Design a binder for this molecule. Sequence first.
Ligand code: SAH
Length: 266
Amino acid sequence: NHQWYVCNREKLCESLQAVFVQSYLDQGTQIFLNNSIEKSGWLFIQLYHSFVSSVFSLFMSRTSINGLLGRGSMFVFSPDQFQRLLKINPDWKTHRLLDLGAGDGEVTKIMSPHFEEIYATELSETMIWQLQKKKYRVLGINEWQNTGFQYDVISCLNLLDRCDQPLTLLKDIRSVLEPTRGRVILALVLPFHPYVENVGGKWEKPSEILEIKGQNWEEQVNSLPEVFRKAGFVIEAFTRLPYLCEGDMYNDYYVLDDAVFVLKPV
Ligand SMILES: Nc1ncnc2c1ncn2[C@@H]1O[C@H](CSCC[C@H](N)C(=O)O)[C@@H](O)[C@H]1O
């Protein structure tokens, strides 16, 4: 419970202590955990998924396998947590949303009711199927920057460390964000450990290095204002949320340490 959300606010720098928002384990988080515990109890389905995965991981990424089997869904924030972090009301709506590296869209649908048009990018073929099943407009990874129109909210959750050019991405996002009321939602697992996902436990180094240093969560968060400022952003709000993932035969679920930011352009 509290270990996922608590923060040593005294270790944060001046800028960050003002914009920090405290999050809590609400019912939306508890519904995902209970659903995850239920799914993980189905031994034979998990065994079948495990054996299919062990064969398909010889030529397929773990992400594409999860999208093929409809498994491994994840959780970043509840609708309530998303609204409290963005400082909006449940009825708030705007025009366009762009979710980069949206995966199977289970996190995207948390933000989806607040938008009229939803766009996504995704490298995995099977995940693209999941996004199209939700009727999102999927764009190429080098197509969303050159559409002509801008985006009110650009979401970039748990992608910077899985990306080959995170610095270019942050600047590409700034170029097509709506200047007046546009906002960026960004999530990162800390400690920052970047790698490009490939096939069968194979990873590569990113081409562009983000200078995210520190020996704990607060020190690494302190290193990010410079990174965000280099791309033309300032932190309007940020919080500490557990990055949750559905489980398997051995664990009911998995937890990672997410730092979630709301960025406004400057
Ligand atoms: N260059 C790229 N362009 C678009 N998607 C990418 C990408 N590189 C990796 N991805 C995708 O980004 C995802 C990272 S996992 C993040 C999934 C989801 N946004 C969440 O927070 O839960 C994977 O689905 C991966 O296939």
